[PDB]
């Protein structure tokens, strides 16, 4: 519901005429919450027989 | 339980994998704790029997 659904829609529905345009905005939205650097950290080893 | 069980081993415990090290560092310790000179001390002579 991120655009042409605002005040056009009930709560409980969904605009089925825009649904392309809001699944390519969830997915931008996916994309750019992704945006980061698998940074490293402490390896170690274990002494446990698994 | 010289090396690598400290802290996650529990007092009746000891950790197979780590058999060899602990081995041998308790050798170790057994080495150092006999480097010293044989004294001579005072004598007497004997009159018992054979």
Same mark, same amino acid.
């Given at each position: #519901? @991120? *655009?042409?659904? $605002?005040?056009?829609? !009930? +709560?409980?529905?969904?605009?089925?005429?825009?649904? $392309? /345009? +809001? *699944?390519?905005?969830?997915?931008?939205?996916? =994309?750019? /919450?992704?945006? #980061?650097? +698998? #940074? /490293?950290?402490?390896? @170690? /080893? !274990? *002494? @446990? =027989?698994?």
């Amino acid at each position: #519901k @991120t *655009v042409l659904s $605002r005040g056009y829609i !009930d +709560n409980a529905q969904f605009n089925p005429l825009a649904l $392309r /345009s +809001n *699944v390519l905005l969830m997915l931008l939205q996916f =994309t750019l /919450s992704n945006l #980061k650097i +698998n #940074k /490293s950290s402490t390896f @170690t /080893s !274990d *002494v @446990t =027989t698994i």
